[PDB]
Design a protein around this ligand. Sequence first.
Ligand code: NO2
Ligand code: NO2
Ligand code: NO2
Ligand code: CU
Ligand code: CU
Ligand code: CU
Ligand code: CU
Ligand code: CU
Ligand code: CU
Lengths: 337, 336, 336
Amino acid sequence: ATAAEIAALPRQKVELVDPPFVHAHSQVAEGGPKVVEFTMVIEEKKIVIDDAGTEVHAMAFNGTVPGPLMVVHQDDYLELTLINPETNTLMHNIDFHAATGALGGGGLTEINPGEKTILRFKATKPGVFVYHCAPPGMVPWHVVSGMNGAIMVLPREGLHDGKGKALTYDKIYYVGEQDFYVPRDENGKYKKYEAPGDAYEDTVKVMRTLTPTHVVFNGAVGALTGDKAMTAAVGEKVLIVHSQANRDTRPHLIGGHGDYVWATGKFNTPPDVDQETWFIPGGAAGAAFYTFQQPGIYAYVNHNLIEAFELGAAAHFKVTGEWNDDLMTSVLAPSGT
Amino acid sequence: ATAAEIAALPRQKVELVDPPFVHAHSQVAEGGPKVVEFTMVIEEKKIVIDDAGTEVHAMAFNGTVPGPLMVVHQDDYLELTLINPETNTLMHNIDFHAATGALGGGGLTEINPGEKTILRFKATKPGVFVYHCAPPGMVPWHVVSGMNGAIMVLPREGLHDGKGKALTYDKIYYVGEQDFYVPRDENGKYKKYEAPGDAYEDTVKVMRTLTPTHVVFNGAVGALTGDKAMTAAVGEKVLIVHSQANRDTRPHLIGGHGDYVWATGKFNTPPDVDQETWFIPGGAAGAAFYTFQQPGIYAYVNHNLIEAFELGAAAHFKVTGEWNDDLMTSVLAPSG
Amino acid sequence: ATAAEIAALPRQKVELVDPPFVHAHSQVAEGGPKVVEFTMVIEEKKIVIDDAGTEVHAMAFNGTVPGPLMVVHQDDYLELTLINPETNTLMHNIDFHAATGALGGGGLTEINPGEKTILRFKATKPGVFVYHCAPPGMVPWHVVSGMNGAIMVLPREGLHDGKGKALTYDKIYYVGEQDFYVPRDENGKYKKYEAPGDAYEDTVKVMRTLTPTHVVFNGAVGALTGDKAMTAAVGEKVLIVHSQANRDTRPHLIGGHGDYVWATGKFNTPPDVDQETWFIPGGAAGAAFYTFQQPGIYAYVNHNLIEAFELGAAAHFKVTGEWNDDLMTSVLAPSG
Ligand SMILES: O=N[O-]
Ligand SMILES: O=N[O-]
Ligand SMILES: O=N[O-]
Ligand SMILES: [Cu+2]
Ligand SMILES: [Cu+2]
Ligand SMILES: [Cu+2]
Ligand SMILES: [Cu+2]
Ligand SMILES: [Cu+2]
Ligand SMILES: [Cu+2]
């Protein structure tokens, strides 16, 4: 409860890491409640989102789309220092869906260029939750320009299945999915602009059609493919956290499953099990736990397969280990009749 | 129950109230099963849905979009008197998703202007449920002209959580979300018409694109804001009923949560807890229970934020009470 | 188990039947795990999908859209022989969402015209699951040309509710829902093409709008209406399996409910109960169990009612039996 009991608590300062990785943390909390401190700087910057060179003026927490994942435990305090550099042109703020009051923090964190603010909130509910910018009057425009991310509030006793058995992951990846709305010219070619403000009117027109031009993971088409594929091994337990701040998605691991899936993202609601394809509504984050049982390349997609393979929403996993013929085998390889 | 057994049950006549409020009712049922009687009159009327003076020909149960919320308990009988006055132009009917048989009542309730009908059904399943008009051959046009609402069938023992603990609300509000499809002319200006039937063909062309021109709560952009903001106080338990008869939605209370959410709307399915944003498919109602912990303005939105802030799907709650600094505080206010 | 153990299991050859019917099977497994063998031939062929003569070049497992339902039990092996005749023009393969490894089998089953392959996988998780074609670089085009179906892996002890009570169905139907994307010329008329390849660029342009031109059950508008309505009787318990390989759907039985709904399709996740409309994400299958209480015609729809009644997503059930006036009755029939 009290203002002094809080200044009494230990403080841990965390250095953030760029998605899809997640900063070091412990699944089971060591000791009691803490004040966990994070800093993010906002950057307005041009990013290229496909191999054709399509540009968007992104508005990026910590310079990445999505913003990085913050991890705390239930009843810790999260204290954010948020900095809007004077090289930026717009006001920004932050709404944590994990927080209670003042529009998730948004009403207390409106910062013009050259301003900074420090917000603290108590993480009362365990789960993964979206955060995003929401300035009055231009809420969707900052969100669909990339200004969103997620946090994970772990139970103090770590994750468990619906029946109290402990679930401990070997590694965690954070996939942020972003719908972008890029205006086109009369030839069907994407338009380029000087500053974020100049793109505004044309972009609202595309937003009103409710049809994105690109739906991407980690800020671009093919961002998490090739040398940037996520990795695991046979027998490894992986937690994949996925967020979408504006639009629904339906994740699926091609060649795998979600063994336990908190599709709602909230760890006091028991997980669905054995899932093929799960559903995360726009404005939420979800998490899926899987133990890999076969080696090779997997794709991780939004299973509207037009959004995956035409609009960009596909990533890869490269998994090392030995093949299990009991689980699957080619009895007759492709061969002439 | 035999027809005799039904005839000896007490009857109770209910007066409906306009959304987002709900008629008086008790959470735990007082006594045994009843026949609960309601009457609705259908009104075809022009509504203006945004601040640019855009019009829809609404087809409104009891004259509101959405129609009003009706509340019974499990195993009561709902008896509806439905009237289509002679001032209307179209046939109408009603399909209750809570009812069993005859297309939810649609096949027994077809009434032309100048006609009335009385339908009775047993509310066998507890939950919130959509109702809507559905005349053969013109089903989606009546629904997306606002002819839909919801009913709530409470368990006889009131609401409970996953583990049988009782959940009693202080306040209930009913938010009906409506997708509208208004035709535009050559210069992108919304068209006006002089009778509902004149708008039919142009409207169908817009509907087949699957993209609404407006998505609103309580029948208009800004309906539940400012002045018509829903109110509560810190510490009050509030049940928010939300329906969408045609298209998906994903409600979210900005600055709060759904502490218990029956996202499917059905009270025998245990609620999800601690939700940030929940999902109601088109054709269903859902309900979220929350205890307010901070004062101030909250927005309640469909969290496709283009639908909320560009197309109209946003409401406000104004909440009185004292600020809790343990839950949230400004450590350093915006500064140089 | 050992290698000699696997090699020694009994084999059972099953003859498939076209949707919405399902091959004979037992709910409770008889005896121990088996290797269940199925054969499907792929057919590329023009089909007419609406009453205006609109044609699509379908890519059809076993000649139907959707492909047929295959039923095995948990820890059986499914062994599929897949044949791509030399009269087709494209390479195809198959991804089973129920399988583990090699992109669901897609990496091991790429067959050119004139080739066959045999894949075996162990069905380790119980549920209904989508299967579909997925050739690298052309995945959505084969899926939205109809090249998808579902399998059901039953628990060895048959279905049960959340409380472990047995659920035994009398009839099972499979409804496959398909989104099609058919190009139009500048006059608004649907285009026709000589070969499947000729339609590819124009179809991808429509696909990128994310808006189907048609959403159908069993491969055409009205395929499951009229004399092809699905049938049941009052008191029969029906399982309805529904799949959508690419796009979300929200099924609803108009006049009925889903008494138990595995909306995720996975039988180790307890079913939701008393559902009015449930929600199946694109890329999944779901299953709903209902006991019919009232006779008459029911419609079974995607409850975006524009998709149901303008774009094709509506089926009928015809149910025989005696009317139950306790559940529903017309107290006063429509009158002046
Ligand atoms: O199984 N992914 O299409
Ligand atoms: O948290 N509202 O976007
Ligand atoms: O109740 N079906 O619209
Ligand atoms: Cu911003
Ligand atoms: Cu939000
Ligand atoms: Cu009507
Ligand atoms: Cu309906
Ligand atoms: Cu194919
Ligand atoms: Cu798939």
